[PDB]
């Protein structure tokens, strides 16, 4: 088969730079490469076909050229909406192959996280288990620390925590962390904290609340 | 306009089968070769299989060879991929998409259906709230949601007051528990004048088990 090599694997630039974007074949695929986006929950969207060409209604400020082995696509001016998966794809010959891919990522000033707490709910508590969620709240970079404390111990291994993708308007991310115990557990402790770290923060921000 | 729909994917059996379709409108079926890709949670494209427009012709990647079937009933505009002898490396969302016979490239795609492949039981959502208070209120802003817990399989949809209110909300990505079961949360921020006016109800659905809840959200 024909092997597509995509680089970079991330690409990180500011909102408004100019986004290169390279993909070599394994062997000459002529010009039968094509480029696709794909943005968080759903299908990829064909951008360019026959190496150059803009399929319709696709933006002016995307573009492709090359032939044989070397390809590129161009994204003239990054705009916030162009946080995807960018994905190339030939079919010079069976089996029809793709790249592994190109996250393109835009790099927003630092914002620090909002921080929230939320207490287990009466219903869940009556079926044995108590789970607290954190959340942190459109933020950048995607880099940050949460620690849960009950009564001052560190929780570890009994939390899972989720970030969304990057907001396709402001460039943020959002991230929420459940920390689950027993409701007998929940009711031997008092004091339930959520702790953040992040660069856009002086120090940590804790919220916390008592059960009692 | 063009539009491919799929529909068939659900949760399956290693060793059983299912087959998916695609329905396919605004264009004429016949007249072009079609193609199922594939796409496993967290990783990137995988062709599956190609088909010619009268289907007399097919093509397989070599990890479906003698698995799966490829086929089409132009009459019925519809596509399908009979799959059998599922693996757990089967799991994926499937896409249909439409082939340009000059230029080779798939020029247009359905959104896609789920298959899992699995031995682990459906299982519907509990759906607790996350209840706004002074310890989730940040200065005029505060903030709610819905966890909806320990479910199987994927997907859940959760909208807010119907589809009403969509600014500031954050569905998260469903994680997958060391119980072999999912759990996701979606969060909105909110006016904190508006804790005591508004309602903010929260629909989940869970297709798979049949499971809808719509929660509604009071301040703690």
């Known amino acids: 088969e024909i092997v597509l090599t995509q680089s970079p694997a991330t690409l990180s630039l500011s909102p408004g730079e100019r986004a290169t974007l390279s993909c070599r074949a394994s062997?000459?695929?002529?010009?039968?490469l094509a480029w696709y986006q794909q943005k968080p929950g759903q299908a990829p969207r064909l951008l360019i076909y026959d190496a150059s060409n803009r399929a319709t209604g696709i933006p002016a400020r995307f573009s492709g050229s090359g032939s044989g082995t070397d390809f590129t696509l161009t994204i003239s001016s990054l705009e916030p909406e162009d946080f995807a998966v960018y994905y190339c794809?030939?079919?010079?010959?069976?089996?029809?192959?793709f790249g592994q891919g190109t996250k393109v990522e835009i790099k927003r000033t630092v914002a620090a996280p909002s921080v929230f707490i939320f207490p287990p709910s009466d219903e869940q508590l009556k079926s044995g288990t108590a789970s607290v969620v954190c959340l942190l709240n459109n933020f950048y970079p995607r880099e940050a620390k949460v620690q849960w404390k009950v009564d001052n111990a560190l929780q570890s291994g009994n939390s899972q925590e989720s970030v969304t993708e990057q907001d396709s308007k402001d460039s943020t991310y959002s991230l929420s962390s459940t920390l689950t115990l027993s409701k007998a557990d929940y009711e031997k402790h008092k004091v339930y904290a959520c702790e953040v770290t992040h660069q856009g923060l002086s120090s940590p921000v804790t919220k916390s609340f008592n059960r009692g | 306009e063009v539009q491919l729909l799929e529909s068939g994917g659900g949760l399956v059996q290693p060793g059983g089968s299912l087959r998916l379709s695609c329905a396919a409108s605004g264009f004429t079926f016949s007249s072009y070769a079609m193609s199922w890709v594939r796409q496993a949670p967290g990783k990137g494209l995988e062709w599956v299989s190609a088909?010619?427009?009268?289907?007399?012709?097919?093509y397989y990647a070599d990890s479906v060879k003698g698995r799966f079937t490829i086929s089409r009933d132009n009459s019925k505009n519809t596509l399908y991929l009979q799959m059998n002898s599922l693996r757990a490396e089967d799991t994926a969302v499937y896409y249909c998409?439409?082939?340009?016979?000059?230029?080779?490239?798939?020029?247009?795609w359905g959104q896609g259906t789920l298959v899992t492949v699995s031995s682990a039981s459906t299982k519907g959502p509990s759906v607790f709230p996350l209840a706004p208070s002074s310890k989730s209120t940040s200065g005029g802003t505060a903030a709610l949601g819905c966890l909806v817990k320990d479910y199987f399989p994927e997907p859940v949809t959760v909208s807010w007051n119907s589809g009403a209110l969509t600014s500031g909300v954050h569905t998260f990505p469903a994680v997958l528990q060391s119980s072999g079961l999912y759990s996701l949360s979606s969060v909105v921020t909110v006016p904190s004048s508006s804790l005591g006016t508004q309602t903010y109800i929260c629909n989940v659905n869970h297709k798979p088990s049949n499971t809808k809840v719509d929660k509604k959200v009071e301040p703690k």
């Open positions: 088909i010619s427009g009268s289907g007399g012709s097919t």
């Open positions: 062997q000459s695929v002529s010009s039968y």
């Open positions: 998409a439409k082939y340009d016979g000059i230029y080779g490239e798939l020029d247009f």
């Open positions: 794809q030939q079919r010079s010959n069976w089996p029809l192959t």
